[PDB]
């Protein structure tokens, strides 16, 4: 009926863009408009299971904004994620009655008291959670909260489920486009670095920009390059730098020959407590290192540095972070917990980024070896 026309229009709106942010904003807005509820949100999960409120629509100021909030994976037990990975919608109509209805696509159960206390503390009277699948995994959740009690029609449930399936498809296609674009940008960065590597300009001028653009494309707070080959011993830096002893460290752990690419977090430097502490006194929390050695002989070292991942977000820009709404008590505690897990942990680099590091390192090693052999034959 008019239901199918509504689903058609909303699906057109969700699928209009291949940009993930536009997809999720259209999703939350359209679903909140359909349901008339106070707050509709999308929670996205990371590989470790931690959740981030990545999109949000509100009908007014009755419920506070949670956009940008992050919470530890443990806030949703694996027992709940099991049901969600088996495609399962969960509605709590009354928080005071503590009822929990569970429905499948295509009658009342109890609910854990801790989650009831959580929803009460946020001033949430009614909750509807629909899972968002990506291939076989649980990409995230579509969440509708309301400050007064309200039931949910079965046709409302099926409309939200069908919209969730369209959201899943849009997520997959946006991912296809994003992977293509990232592959393009990575190859472009490799070639742009090679453009400056063999350039006849002053090495200190070109290589500093090389390190700067390398740090840029790998979202690193800094970059460093130490060449120690034949008669050439040089050190170029950009951005945040480690203590100089780091260089000597890389020379004494060469057996961990040839060329390689390695990742390290601050935690991985537990063996060397003095270097670990010096590194701590630095914003550096992650290191991507490439031993420049295209030939069998070691040539140098190329490093990119990332900070702690928590610092990568302007948490003070959010309303929930600074303003003392009591309903933000338990969410903020959750955030605190998450902050305790990622206060010294960096964002890891992908396998594609490590391969990029390896390729840039091969270019660097070959270039330096060629130049030094040409200067030694003189
Ligand atoms: C963005 C702010 C926010 C957070 C963080 C949040 C947490 C949260 N707790 C959930 C469930 C759950 N959470 C818990 C347990 C707990 N959870 C805790 O934070 C405690 C540490 C612990 C109790 C001691 C349990 C047991 C469930 C499953 C409840 C059930 O369906 O029976 C779910 C899954 C949705 C659902 O099935 O209702 C979410 C999203 N909800 C929000 O809106």
Residue numbers in the entry: 12 to 117, 131 to 280, 284 to 405
Paper text:
One major class in microorganisms and plants is the phytochromes (Phys), a diverse collection of dimeric chromoproteins that employ a covalently-bound bilin (or open chain tetrapyrrole) prosthetic group that can assume two conformers, a red light-absorbing Pr state and a metastable far-red light-absorbing Pfr state. Through fast photointerconversion between Pr and Pfr and slower thermal reversion of Pfr back to Pr, Phys acts as photoswitches in detecting light fluence, duration, photoperiod, and the ratio of red and far-red light. The bilin is buried within a GAF domain pocket, which through numerous chromophore/protein contacts provides the unique absorption and photochromicity of these photoreceptors. Besides canonical Phys, cyanobacteria express several variants, including a PAS-less subfamily that harbors just the GAF and PHY domains for light detection.
